[PDB]
Design a protein around this ligand. Structure first.
Ligand SMILES: O=C1CC[C@H](N2C(=O)c3ccccc3C2=O)C(=O)N1
Ligand SMILES: [Zn+2]
Length: 104
Protein backbone atom coordinates (compact mmCIF):
# COMPACT_ATOMS: atom_id res chain seq x y z
CA UNK A 1 0.00 0.00 0.00
CA UNK A 2 2.82 2.66 0.61
CA UNK A 3 5.64 3.37 -1.87
CA UNK A 4 9.07 4.36 -0.48
CA UNK A 5 12.40 5.24 -2.06
CA UNK A 6 14.20 1.98 -2.63
CA UNK A 7 17.61 3.53 -1.86
CA UNK A 8 16.81 5.02 1.54
CA UNK A 9 13.21 4.47 2.63
CA UNK A 10 11.85 8.00 2.24
CA UNK A 11 8.03 7.97 2.12
CA UNK A 12 6.96 8.87 -1.47
CA UNK A 13 3.40 7.82 -2.43
CA UNK A 14 0.51 5.34 -1.93
CA UNK A 15 -1.27 2.79 -4.13
CA UNK A 16 -4.50 4.76 -3.52
CA UNK A 17 -2.85 7.70 -5.38
CA UNK A 18 -2.25 5.76 -8.59
CA UNK A 19 -3.52 7.56 -11.77
CA UNK A 20 -4.70 5.67 -14.77
CA UNK A 21 -3.39 8.09 -17.58
CA UNK A 22 -4.84 7.11 -20.98
CA UNK A 23 -6.35 3.94 -19.53
CA UNK A 24 -3.35 2.56 -17.51
CA UNK A 25 -1.27 3.65 -14.60
CA UNK A 26 1.84 1.99 -16.13
CA UNK A 27 3.60 3.32 -19.27
CA UNK A 28 6.73 1.62 -20.58
CA UNK A 29 8.84 4.36 -22.24
CA UNK A 30 12.39 5.09 -23.52
CA UNK A 31 14.36 8.28 -23.28
CA UNK A 32 16.73 9.63 -25.86
CA UNK A 33 19.71 7.90 -24.14
CA UNK A 34 18.04 4.52 -24.92
CA UNK A 35 17.05 3.85 -21.28
CA UNK A 36 13.72 2.05 -20.75
CA UNK A 37 11.58 2.96 -17.75
CA UNK A 38 8.39 1.36 -16.32
CA UNK A 39 6.74 4.59 -15.29
CA UNK A 40 3.80 4.50 -12.80
CA UNK A 41 1.52 7.56 -12.81
CA UNK A 42 0.46 8.99 -9.44
CA UNK A 43 -1.86 11.91 -8.86
CA UNK A 44 0.13 12.79 -5.74
CA UNK A 45 3.57 12.13 -4.13
CA UNK A 46 5.59 13.57 -1.31
CA UNK A 47 9.22 13.50 -0.07
CA UNK A 48 10.66 14.45 -3.48
CA UNK A 49 12.76 17.39 -4.49
CA UNK A 50 11.91 18.87 -7.89
CA UNK A 51 14.84 20.23 -9.83
CA UNK A 52 15.36 22.54 -12.72
CA UNK A 53 13.05 24.24 -15.12
CA UNK A 54 9.97 22.52 -16.59
CA UNK A 55 10.50 21.38 -20.09
CA UNK A 56 8.23 20.12 -22.92
CA UNK A 57 11.09 18.49 -24.83
CA UNK A 58 10.73 14.68 -25.37
CA UNK A 59 7.74 14.58 -23.02
CA UNK A 60 6.09 11.16 -23.03
CA UNK A 61 2.77 12.76 -22.13
CA UNK A 62 1.17 15.13 -24.62
CA UNK A 63 0.57 18.65 -23.38
CA UNK A 64 2.75 18.26 -20.23
CA UNK A 65 6.05 19.76 -19.28
CA UNK A 66 8.42 17.81 -16.92
CA UNK A 67 10.82 18.50 -14.08
CA UNK A 68 13.19 15.92 -12.66
CA UNK A 69 12.05 14.43 -9.36
CA UNK A 70 14.75 13.33 -6.91
CA UNK A 71 14.24 11.61 -3.60
CA UNK A 72 14.29 14.60 -1.18
CA UNK A 73 16.27 12.58 1.36
CA UNK A 74 18.99 10.72 -0.65
CA UNK A 75 18.91 12.44 -4.07
CA UNK A 76 18.04 9.23 -6.02
CA UNK A 77 16.35 9.97 -9.30
CA UNK A 78 12.81 8.63 -8.78
CA UNK A 79 10.99 10.06 -11.79
CA UNK A 80 9.44 13.27 -13.05
CA UNK A 81 6.75 15.82 -12.12
CA UNK A 82 4.45 16.79 -14.97
CA UNK A 83 2.63 20.09 -15.21
CA UNK A 84 1.06 22.49 -17.65
CA UNK A 85 -1.61 20.14 -19.04
CA UNK A 86 -5.27 19.39 -18.49
CA UNK A 87 -7.37 16.89 -16.52
CA UNK A 88 -5.30 16.69 -14.53
CA UNK A 89 -3.08 19.80 -14.64
CA UNK A 90 -0.27 17.98 -12.92
CA UNK A 91 0.85 14.47 -11.87
CA UNK A 92 3.91 12.39 -11.11
CA UNK A 93 5.56 9.76 -13.28
CA UNK A 94 7.70 7.60 -10.99
CA UNK A 95 10.07 4.80 -11.98
CA UNK A 96 8.66 1.57 -10.56
CA UNK A 97 11.95 -0.26 -9.95
CA UNK A 98 13.28 2.75 -7.95
CA UNK A 99 10.49 2.36 -5.35
CA UNK A 100 9.80 -0.27 -2.69
CA UNK A 101 6.18 -1.20 -1.99
CA UNK A 102 5.02 -2.19 1.49
CA UNK A 103 2.54 -1.91 4.40
CA UNK A 104 1.32 1.39 5.95
O1 LIG B 1 8.74 12.78 -20.39
C1 LIG B 1 9.95 12.64 -20.29
C2 LIG B 1 10.79 12.88 -19.05
C3 LIG B 1 12.19 13.34 -19.33
C4 LIG B 1 12.88 12.16 -20.09
N1 LIG B 1 14.21 12.47 -20.46
C5 LIG B 1 15.36 11.65 -20.16
O2 LIG B 1 15.16 10.74 -19.25
C6 LIG B 1 16.57 12.21 -20.76
C7 LIG B 1 17.89 11.77 -20.76
C8 LIG B 1 18.79 12.47 -21.58
C9 LIG B 1 18.36 13.52 -22.39
C10 LIG B 1 17.01 13.90 -22.42
C11 LIG B 1 16.15 13.23 -21.55
C12 LIG B 1 14.70 13.34 -21.48
O3 LIG B 1 13.89 14.30 -22.02
C13 LIG B 1 12.09 11.84 -21.37
O4 LIG B 1 12.56 11.42 -22.39
N2 LIG B 1 10.68 12.18 -21.44
ZN1 LIG C 1 15.95 8.09 -1.22
Amino acid sequence: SIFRCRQCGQTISRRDWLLPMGGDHEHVVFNPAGMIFRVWCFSLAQGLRLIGAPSGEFSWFKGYDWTIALCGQCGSHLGWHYEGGSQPQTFFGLIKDRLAEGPA
